[PDB]
Design a protein around this ligand. Structure first.
Ligand SMILES: [Cl-]
Ligand SMILES: [Cl-]
Ligand SMILES: [Fe+3]
Ligand SMILES: [Fe+3]
Ligand SMILES: [Fe+3]
Ligand SMILES: [Fe+3]
Lengths: 144, 145
């Protein structure tokens, strides 16, 4: 892209790890905010939500440098330069999750005697299959 | 098995990995939505944003099973049962990021000849220090009444 090539560098890997941590931080802080909401701590909840916006900005800035430096999506190792490529990355990740990840998690949960957790992973596998199908119909739109 | 004691199981690890992936998917899809927004694809942007809500539900469900199973926060390996423990997990992560992770990333980026990336990591280091201090303030309010 726009900037000096980051391929082959330690910085490339650090941007990926930064993106993973920032992604988790936003989810964690919003989950924590719900506990503060329940308990009656609206100032704590509001701080968590505002900090979570900071973690969004951080995550998106990591993706900017990744894209501009000619690197691939942290989650899928697919390019994310153009909107079509971004939809193709969404399709790849959803496909991995419904064909491999969540069915395997469900099988292991049933073997280890956690049927309720297995049912959740089976719900998710069907959900990611649905996601994949909806993104595939977008891609068809774009290429036409 | 006992779903309230998942420690040491493969299912414990799979909940953690599922959380990581779902967290990334929400961020990715909201970032992709902005590209659809500027190009004039409001239905694609809307789909991305709606699917992103799905990925929020998935991530939060994984955290529910993690906390009910006595497992720790995927990001910090700290318990997250109570609100106080959640704030302590936030402090632990922010402290790692500003004292070690982002300064180290900045040094590597400067040494590799990427000064704009280095400056970004130094901005983030100072940001996570500020976060840590704000969360410390909350803990003082919680711990001391
Ligand atoms: Cl409050
Ligand atoms: Cl559209
Ligand atoms: Fe951050
Ligand atoms: Fe999905
Ligand atoms: Fe999902
Ligand atoms: Fe932070």
């Amino acid at each position: 892209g726009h900037m000096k090539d980051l391929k082959g560098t330690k910085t490339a890997e650090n941007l990926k790890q930064g993106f993973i941590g920032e992604s988790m931080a936003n989810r964690r802080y919003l989950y924590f905010a719900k506990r503060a909401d329940e308990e009656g701590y609206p100032e704590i909840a509001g701080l968590l939500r505002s900090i979570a916006e900071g973690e969004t900005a951080h995550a998106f800035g990591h993706l900017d440098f990744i894209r501009q430096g000619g690197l691939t999506d942290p989650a899928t190792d697919k390019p994310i330069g153009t909107l079509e490529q971004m939809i193709e990355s969404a399709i790849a990740g959803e496909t991995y999750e419904w064909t491999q990840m969540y069915p395997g998690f469900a099988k292991v949960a049933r073997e280890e005697g956690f049927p309720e957790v297995a049912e959740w992973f089976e719900t998710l596998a069907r959900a990611e299959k649905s996601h994949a199908e909806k993104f595939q119909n977008v891609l068809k739109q774009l290429k036409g």
